[PDB]
Amino acid sequence: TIEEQAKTFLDKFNHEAEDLFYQSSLASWNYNTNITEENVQN
């Protein structure tokens, strides 16, 4: 029972975490590709 809901929790976490980490990694790649203070803020 508790294992099932924990698995559901992890499944819910995975999809949102993927998108957010992709956004963060893309922003970091942009800041390392160019160099601007706007990219620092991003």
Curated annotation (Swiss-Prot):
Species classification: Eukaryota, Metazoa, Chordata, Craniata, Vertebrata
Subcellular localization: Cell membrane; Cytoplasm; Cell projection, Cilium; Apical cell membrane
Family: Belongs to the peptidase M2 family.
Stated consequence of mutating E18A: No effect on interaction with SARS-CoV spike glycoprotein
Residue positions with a glycan: N34
Superkingdom of source: Eukaryota
From-to range in the entire protein, with total length: 20 to 61 of 805
Substitution effect: L10F: Increases slightly the interaction with RBD domain of SARS-CoV-2 spike protein
Effect ascribed to mutating F21D: Increases slightly the interaction with RBD domain of SARS-CoV-2 spike protein
PTM annotation, UniProt: Proteolytic cleavage by ADAM17 generates a secreted form. Also cleaved by serine proteases: TMPRSS2, TMPRSS11D and HPN/TMPRSS1.
Protein name (record): Angiotensin-converting enzyme 2
